[model samples]
Target: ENPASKPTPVQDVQGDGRWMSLHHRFVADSKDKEPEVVFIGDSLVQLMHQSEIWRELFSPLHALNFGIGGDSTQHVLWRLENGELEHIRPKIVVVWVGTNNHGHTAEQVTGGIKAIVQLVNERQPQARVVVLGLLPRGQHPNPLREKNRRVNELVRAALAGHPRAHFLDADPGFVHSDGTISHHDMYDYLHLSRLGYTPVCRALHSLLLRLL
Candidate 1:
């Protein structure tokens, strides 16, 4: 029933096979690169590699991104099991999915994220896992945003306070006093714009400084 923790590929609804192509590319990248930081999750983490701040921050650290847009935890789990974690020894594996588990309950989402971390720890035992708490979504105050907040709380308690697994909340001050998220920060209020990437990139850079 809790498909969140299960390992499954994207449905490939469009029949384009782009999702599998992305996963295959990630596997190939791992074979060639010994990146210090490995970022794996859904679009947020995937899009980080495309952002301008990536060059400024993560490139120097030798980070490889394996993010896939619209991926849920199950998809990420499948990626790891399917050789994405092979042939490379990374110091940190950053997880930032769970927000796209649209219909899953907060508890199920948390379990899914925890399962991802468990997979990383078991397979890449030498790598420390940095799990990004699910960021708030929606353009304004909404039930869905609150749902993500609850997931954040559950995830923090589940993943934090451990030596190998740490949780970080990368909220870029998106919300305002007027109880609204600025379009400037998140162009669609779910994805980050360049301005929004600044704070998140900075936060990860700081953590990598200490952890790596």
Candidate 2:
């Protein structure tokens, strides 16, 4: 599919209005508090706020997590468009999404991700954007994992040469040498465990330090 023909992104606000409520809360919260770093994406990003690692690693940095479980690229694009990022002006925006877009082609996924970066650049030109590759999933090599790999490849290619955007592939550290994911890293073969985020936090912290 041509990237030009991809549909415009929209927010997923179905199912009990839980995400909608949370999205509104974020907008309200940012109005009062100033953030230096913003974390936005799917469950992998949202659930991080509940983890101890988030407090130990990123909380002190004044980071805000705008992640929503089961969110696709379009959902995030909608959030950005609907004033999720309207109040706060951060120095950096960390984005990791597209796992839920597994149904879409790699081109579509890449286009969505790039559109997100484009928005961040437009809204917060001074902020650096760190785009993490879609994390590998499943205990072993599977079609979903391959799909994630293809999406990452496209994301990397799309972000190449962008001035304020940097693409980081942290997938390798999440997998074992045998190409299998461990329960220690991802308890459900998708969500990261506390131990799983140690390396991720390290890498992210390192990059943030350089950017800061």
Candidate 3:
């Protein structure tokens, strides 16, 4: 299948009651709130808000979290089009989506992400976009792990020389020398635990300070 044929802005509020409710809430927040930085992505991104790192570090920067659990590239596309980016002209927009598309090929996932980046630029041209590579998943070497690695590779190549768009991989030191993921870092071998977020936050802070 051609990656270009895949849906750009995926349909919104599919049947998940929780997702629907959150989507409306985020839309309402975006309508009136003016944030300097906006974080957008799936469950991994949503979990960041619950971490202490968000309060102690990001709160001072007037950041808003637009992440939703189980959101794929299509869902994020829907959110971006609806009202998430409507009124806010942020200095930086951090996007970390595409993880939920486990069934998609690397090219497809990369295309979806690039579409999101393009939309961000279109909505807020002045905003510097930070695209975080997909976080590693699974405890050991697996098909899903390889899939994400390929997606990251494709996105890195695609975003080369992008002026306002920067791609950063936050997975360098997450794995152990034995090639296994620790529960201490990823509680479920997927979501980042409190300890796991420390390094992720550290890298982002440095970049945010430079940009914002």
Candidate 4:
């Protein structure tokens, strides 16, 4: 279940065609009616599968995991365009992303994110989109934490008043009173472990019930 040591070369690649190949597989797969809820994001979403969180919490709602490790907003957009929207439009789209665009600024990440929203609007207008805020890039001691906060602020601001879009922050639950992550909640530095996953499921359950 711990994929910490696996070397996924495609995500590690850079340049134009880097992620396109693997992205096709995801796009081709999204057309089915495996679930009414779609979870789309980077590693965090992918890691959740290893825990029983999704099955325990979201299976009743027919949740589908479309997570791809190392995907950013642009990569998500590309996948949506290429094939992820083929059949069976979802009722709720849960999106958490943009951490891997290392050199991109908050504004740049916003553009990529906006493109994602637009793609959903164009393809699945009636579907509700639940945008999960990017978590603090906990691996470093630099300003990426601040950057993540700023980006989340922009995301909330932009998503506000959109009737079909809802914004969520997963960071607060991941951090302790001292503002650092609770070590027992994580496996490496950023990805959540079982302790961390349960909180997310509980939080999401409350959020969904309120929205419903």
Q: Per-model C-alpha lDDT, please? A: 0.89, 0.84, 0.85, 0.71
What's model 2's TM-score? 0.91
Per-residue lDDT tens digits for candidate 4, residues 1-212, read: 11211112244445676455556656566754655777777888777766787677777787766677777776677666666777866777778777776777887776677778878889888788888887764644457777777888998999998878888886545655566675677666677778877767687767766665
Candidate 2: list runs displaced more than 4 Å: 1-15
Model 4, clash count? 2
Supply candidate 1's per-residue lDDT for 198: 88
RMSD of each: 1.0, 2.4, 2.2, 6.4
Worst 10 residues of 1 by lDDT: 155-164
Which residue pairs of candidate 4 clash? 27-83, 27-84
lDDT of 2 by residue, 126-183 (tens): 8999999888889988888888888899888888989789998865477788988999
Let me know the TM-score candidate 4 reaches against the reference structure: 0.83
Which model, 1 or 3, shows the larger TM-score?
A: 1
Q: Clashing pairs in model 1?
A: none
Error of 2 at 172 (Å): 4.4
- Tell how far residue 29 is off in model 4, in angstroms: 3.4
Question: Where in model 3 is the C-alpha error above 4 Å?
Answer: 1-16
